[PDB]
Amino acid sequence: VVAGTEFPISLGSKISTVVKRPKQKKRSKKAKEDEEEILVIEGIEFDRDVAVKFDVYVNDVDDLPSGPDKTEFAGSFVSVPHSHKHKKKMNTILRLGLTDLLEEIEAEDDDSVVVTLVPKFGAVKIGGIKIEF
Ligand SMILES: [Ca+2]
């Protein structure tokens, strides 16, 4: 488990972190219900000649971390190795839709969720994680 203020981090192993839902959800959990709630993984940085892949999962913040795995796949970041005429590195972002996922895991009443990042290959830095509309 990693605190939100621990980012930026090097994703050398599987990590999880508690991510707050958007502020409007605090007063009314159905605020902005016809808009997609989006998980944003910011400041993804790596050398372009290194293949990168990490997978993203979400679980209910109230689950026991010492208990069985209840994580739900949300998406993946993939980069294929390449060269670039004036950049050694790429600095990018990943956005994943959460609205259906939160309904499926039955966490739509919660104010935060747990986001797990699972590195598969490649050295990569993660700048930050947030949820917004
Ligand atoms: Ca819950």
Author numbering: 370 to 502
Relevant lines from the article:
Tyrosinases (TYRs, EC 1.14.18.1 and EC 1.10.3.1) and catechol oxidases (COs, EC 1.10.3.1) are type III copper‐containing metalloenzymes that constitute the class of polyphenol oxidases (PPOs). More specifically, plant PPOs are expressed as pro‐enzymes (55–65 kDa) consisting of an enzymatically active (40–45 kDa) and a C‐terminal domain (15–19 kDa). The C‐terminal domain plays a significant role in the regulation of the enzyme activity inside the cell by shielding the catalytic pocket of the active centre, and in addition it provides an indispensable motif for the accurate folding of the active domain. Herein, we investigated the activation of PPO1 from Malus domestica (MdPPO1) and present a novel activation mode for plant PPOs driven by self‐cleavage, which is independent of external proteases or any other harsh conditions (e.g., SDS).
